[PDB]
């Protein structure tokens, strides 16, 4: 278990090796209208976009769905108090509104840096998007994510000199979160879910019934769908109605149990191509959550 096939693997592979042969990348000039910028994420089918400051001639940060959620939450509350600035903000001006005195520089990684360094930067900076930037040209090559990193790990270590801990359970490794679980109900208004997203900083919410059994899941991704409509005002509707608008059909929420081996969970997560499993009991009542961050944090501080 100790030192691990994973830790050595990560120290001995470059970030470059995870980049697909061909990818698209969306860049926003910081003078761009916030509204247009979020419409571009949807249009391009993309989660995050580097920010380019033209005056300074460099990347200065990222625009993610979290920023979008933050902005919608502020817009919603501001409207009730007759303040309508938000929508005409340029990226520049919103960043100045929130990155106030407290500075958060762009974190990025060289294509020649270890995958270990990439995993450590995501955990330590509490971040889901790590732009891979070539120090020779200055180009962003690619945006690295937990999902990609885990998939790569599952695939290229497929072969088992297997660490004992792969055959150990979530319970005994203590991977995941089992208390203070943020969740909503069938009827919870979308805006109420926003407030929860903002206050708890959590990527998804299990949707539960009256006995707290999980029947759906409401993600941050399910939130840029609100950038499809030519209105923005439909935030008072229930979470159930909000999810009806999903793209593709839906084979139920992807779940797991506390007593499943880590190996079983990694495989489910990797092949389902999703950010987390909802941890459930015999009766589908939610007992916790296991996210990609949980796993990558486990795999890097040496399993469990």
């Amino acid at each position: 278990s100790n030192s691990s096939v994973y830790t050595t693997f990560m120290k001995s592979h470059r970030c470059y090796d995870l980049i697909p042969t061909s990818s698209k990348l969306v860049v926003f000039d910081t003078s761009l209208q916030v509204k247009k910028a979020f419409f571009a994420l949807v249009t391009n089918g993309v989660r995050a976009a580097p920010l380019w400051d033209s005056k300074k001639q460099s990347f200065v940060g990222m625009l993610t769905i979290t920023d979008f959620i933050n902005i919608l939450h502020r817009y919603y509350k501001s409207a009730l108090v007759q303040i309508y600035e938000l929508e005409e903000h340029k990226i520049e001006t919103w960043r100045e509104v929130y990155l106030q005195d407290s500075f958060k520089p762009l974190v990025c990684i060289s294509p020649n840096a270890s995958l270990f360094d990439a995993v450590s930067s995501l955990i330590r900076n509490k971040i889901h998007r790590l732009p891979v930037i070539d120090p020779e040209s200055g180009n962003t090559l690619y945006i690295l994510t937990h999902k990609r990193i885990l998939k790569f790990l599952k695939l290229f270590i497929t072969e088992f000199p297997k660490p004992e801990f792969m055959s150990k359970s979530l319970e005994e490794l203590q991977i995941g979160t089992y208390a203070n679980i943020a969740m909503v109900r069938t009827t919870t208004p979308v805006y109420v879910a926003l407030g929860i997203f903002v206050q708890h900083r959590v990527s998804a919410l299990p949707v539960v019934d009256e006995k707290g059994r999980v029947v759906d899941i409401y993600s941050k991704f399910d939130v840029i769908n609100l950038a499809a409509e030519k209105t923005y005002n439909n935030l008072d509707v229930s979470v159930t109605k909000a999810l009806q608008h999903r793209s593709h059909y839906f084979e139920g929420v992807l779940k797991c149990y506390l007593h499943e081996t880590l190996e079983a969970i990694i495989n489910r997560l990797v092949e389902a191509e999703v950010h987390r499993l909802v941890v459930v009991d015999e009766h589908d009542v939610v007992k916790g959550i296991v996210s990609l961050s949980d796993i990558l944090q486990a795999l890097v501080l040496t399993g469990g």
């Binding site: 042969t21 061909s22 990818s23 698209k24």
Partner: protein
């Protein structure tokens, strides 16, 4: 000692060269959203509602990335 005469080439650069070597004029990426010498070339979407969308594909070693810039006018 005679004067000298100039026979001047002209044309060849009469009209500008016609396009298709193998370089595509238009790229439809509908999709419900592998090509050669279009690398490094500028592409754009029509200007819509005061925004410029510039794009090109570049190569880092064996990897290709298509970069889009959204930029106001």
């Amino acid at each position: 000692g005679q004067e000298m005469y100039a026979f001047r080439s002209e044309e060849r650069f009469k009209s500008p060269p016609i396009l298709p070597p193998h370089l595509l004029q238009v790229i439809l990426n509908k999709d419900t959203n592998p090509n050669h010498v279009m690398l490094n070339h500028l592409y754009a979407l029509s200007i819509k509602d005061s925004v410029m969308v510039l794009s090109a594909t570049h190569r880092y070693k064996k990897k290709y990335v298509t970069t889009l810039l959204y930029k106001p006018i």
